[PDB]
Amino acid sequence: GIVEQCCTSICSLYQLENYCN
Amino acid sequence: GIVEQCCTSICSLYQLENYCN
Amino acid sequence: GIVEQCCTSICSLYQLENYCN
Amino acid sequence: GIVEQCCTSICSLYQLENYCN
Amino acid sequence: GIVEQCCTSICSLYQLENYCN
Amino acid sequence: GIVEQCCTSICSLYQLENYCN
Amino acid sequence: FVNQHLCGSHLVEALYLVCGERGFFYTPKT
Amino acid sequence: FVNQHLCGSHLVEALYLVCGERGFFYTPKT
Amino acid sequence: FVNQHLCGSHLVEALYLVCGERGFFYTPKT
Amino acid sequence: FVNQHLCGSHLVEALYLVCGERGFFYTPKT
Amino acid sequence: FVNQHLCGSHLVEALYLVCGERGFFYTPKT
Amino acid sequence: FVNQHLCGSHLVEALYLVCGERGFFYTPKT
Ligand SMILES: [Cl-]
Ligand SMILES: [Cl-]
Ligand SMILES: [Zn+2]
Ligand SMILES: [Zn+2]
């Protein structure tokens, strides 16, 4: 999930957009 | 400048990117 | 909605709780 | 204290209220 | 008080320092 | 740099001012 | 708890604290 | 609500959230 | 832009930043 | 240091940074 | 990404997220 | 005042606090 993607492993601002509605 | 623009109007992340080193 | 209510008036933590998954 | 209660070990928002005036 | 002063006018870090334990 | 000075090792608010323009 | 006046990112912070592990959805108007 | 680790500035931001107008004390020495 | 570790409230503040008006979901359980 | 314009949770953050281990008390009016 | 309305420390947070390891300079008027 | 570990966004929020109108540079590469 997002926490794995961003917190545990680095993510980009683009990958962050994956969680927008 | 960007500090004012972002406050009194709006600014994009792309405009913000300009301020990175 | 809650985002506006909390800004333009007030909202309780209990109202916020409604937005949890 | 609060740091032990919240930071070091998990606390609830109710337990946080313990530190209100 | 300081909470209002810092919001409705300005306050210095030195004034803030007064509120430390 | 600042990260070494502040993040990795403790710094004061005065030492922080080292990074003001 | 006290009532809250929360704009912008402060609302998101409040939702984060309130919801913890449940997470939350943030859905502004428009 | 939930139980979480609230540390540092996040701890005091949570206190602000919970206590608001009541105010609060943050006394890490105890 | 960059890739960084965004955790906790910082993660949701970043989501707020990126998504804004679209809104977002923060679902740490997945 | 510069003078500060600090509302809401920003004042708490500033108090947190200013006071460190001493902690602080936050006491709004009313 | 969405356009941003960012005042005070929120702009600094946004710059921090946007610039990562590059860092950034914050240069208000006056 | 105090000495503390200021990291990441908290570091730049502290710089914002201390420097304000002067502005600042955040240059983690050095
Ligand atoms: Cl604000
Ligand atoms: Cl943190
Ligand atoms: Zn704010
Ligand atoms: Zn943090």
Domain ranges of chain G: 1-30
Q: How far apart are CA K15 and CA L9, in angstroms?
A: 9
Is residue D7 within 8 A of residue H5, CB to CB? The reply is yes
Convert chain B into a string of H (helix), E (strand) and C (coil): CHHHHHHHCCECHHHHHCCEC
Neighbours of C8 (CB within 10 A): 9
Helix (H, G, I), strand (E, B) or coil at H25: strand
Closest C-alpha among L8, C7, H6 to residue K12: L8
Single-letter code of the amino acid located at K22:
R
Do residues K23 and K8 touch, judged by C-beta distance below 8 A?
A: no
Cα(I16)–Cα(J5) distance, integer angstroms: 23
Contact K23 L19 (CB under 8 A): no
Contacts of K28 in chain J (CB under 8 A): none
Identify all chain H residues contacting I9, using CB atoms and an 8 Å cutoff. 10, 13
What is the DSSP code (8-state) at residue I3? E
Cβ distance D1 to H14 less than 8 Å, yes or no, reads no
Technique employed here was X-ray
Separation of alpha carbons I8 and I4, rounded Å: 13
Put simply, the answer to whether E7 touches J3 (Cβ < 8 Å) is no
G18–D contact, CB cutoff 8 A: yes
